[PDB]
Write an enzyme that holds these catalytic residues in place. Structure first.
Site, mmCIF file in Angstrom:
data_model
loop_
_atom_site.group_PDB
_atom_site.id
_atom_site.type_symbol
_atom_site.label_atom_id
_atom_site.label_comp_id
_atom_site.label_asym_id
_atom_site.label_seq_id
_atom_site.Cartn_x
_atom_site.Cartn_y
_atom_site.Cartn_z
ATOM 1 N N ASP A 161 1.414 6.137 2.251
ATOM 2 C CA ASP A 161 2.167 4.994 2.078
ATOM 3 C C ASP A 161 3.465 5.572 1.823
ATOM 4 O O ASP A 161 3.903 6.192 1.655
ATOM 5 C CB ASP A 161 1.746 4.467 0.551
ATOM 6 C CG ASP A 161 1.081 3.245 0.217
ATOM 7 O OD1 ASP A 161 0.188 3.053 0.960
ATOM 8 O OD2 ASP A 161 1.289 2.753 -0.689
ATOM 9 N N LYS A 182 -1.926 2.610 8.586
ATOM 10 C CA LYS A 182 -3.275 3.205 9.486
ATOM 11 C C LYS A 182 -2.963 3.593 10.696
ATOM 12 O O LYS A 182 -2.097 2.996 11.280
ATOM 13 C CB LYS A 182 -4.355 2.176 9.255
ATOM 14 C CG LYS A 182 -4.180 1.217 7.891
ATOM 15 C CD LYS A 182 -4.542 1.908 6.706
ATOM 16 C CE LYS A 182 -5.914 2.387 6.667
ATOM 17 N NZ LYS A 182 -6.286 3.277 5.406
ATOM 18 N N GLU A 231 1.090 0.246 3.607
ATOM 19 C CA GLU A 231 0.202 0.893 3.916
ATOM 20 C C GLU A 231 0.004 0.995 5.068
ATOM 21 O O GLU A 231 -0.064 0.124 6.063
ATOM 22 C CB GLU A 231 -1.047 0.119 3.355
ATOM 23 C CG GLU A 231 -2.518 0.835 3.380
ATOM 24 C CD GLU A 231 -2.406 2.220 2.754
ATOM 25 O OE1 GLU A 231 -2.248 2.013 1.227
ATOM 26 O OE2 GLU A 231 -2.735 3.069 3.223
#
Lengths: 156, 156
Positions: free
Chosen positions: B57, B69, B67
């Site tokens: 984060d 990814k 967030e």
DNA sequence: TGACCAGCTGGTC
DNA sequence: TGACCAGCTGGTC
């Protein structure tokens, strides 16, 4: 963009060379699952990871299987195992020797080998607890570094 | 030891430099949790990681949380989420936007941004299943790369 | 200790 | 697609 980006791009071709060397030895991603470290351990010990393997397990010249684990002693003193330990997971582990590599951040410090007999102590402990808990999976129980250094054989 | 150890020895000082750069930006280990790629995303976007954070984060200059990814497009086409997806985890995810980084090996290709409204489609699918299924955790459900590209804002 | 908490992903039909 | 099957670890007291 941040200023340091210029340094990043400058180091990049070298990182790609590392990834290429890793690919040459069966490792697809140096940035996950201690990939970049696993490679160093393989070249020092002469072990190999085969295509189709299930995780970080390797074999030697005579075909013996081994489970490989790594720790960063600048942060912790216990080796991680499985985030869901239970008898089925233990069953996968029981018959093979384990190779434990000790790291100071990124610098390799030592490598130890433990035989199944030196590990039964913990298998018995975890199994004994799993039952007591009403069959609850254990969330990542640890194996102390001191235990490895005292009961194992130093190979590096 | 394998003859290739000599090449690893040649590349080492550069690898240590990259770990030093990562350490300065709050990343302890470049060989785990996509650490080495995360560094690249942070430098391009200008985001920073919070000390004592929970996972990958980051925050911007205004305090907004994100967030992050990553996916290796050569291997797979679905972004991972959480190994035990449930309403507790979904609650955290609901408040923040997600940054999706696309890679072809270690070569970064693109970065997209999705808002909570854009992901709600999946949140409802998962939450409904959890309640329907008898309150059982979902093991790493995926978000297709096609969905990210078609509902996201390209940032890089 | 150990015991409790938590994070990051690829593969298949 | 969705809905399954799996891997690697750190952190506090």
């Amino acid at each position: 963009s941040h200023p340091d980006l210029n340094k990043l791009l400058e180091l990049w071709p070298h990182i790609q060379e590392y990834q290429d060397l890793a690919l040459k030895h069966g490792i697809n991603d140096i940035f996950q699952d201690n990939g970049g470290k696993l490679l160093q351990v393989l070249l020092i010990t002469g072990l190999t990871v085969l295509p189709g393997r299930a995780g970080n397990d390797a074999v030697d010249n005579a075909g013996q299987e081994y489970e490989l684990k790594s720790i960063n002693i600048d942060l912790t003193k216990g080796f991680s195992t499985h985030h869901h330990m239970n008898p089925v997971i233990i069953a996968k582990a029981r018959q093979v020797p384990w190779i434990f590599a000790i790291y100071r951040g990124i610098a390799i410090e030592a490598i130890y080998r433990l035989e199944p007999k030196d590990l039964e102590f913990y298998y018995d402990k975890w199994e004994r607890k799993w039952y007591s808990d009403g069959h609850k999976d254990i969330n990542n129980p640890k194996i102390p570094v001191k235990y490895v250094m005292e009961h194992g054989t130093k190979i590096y």
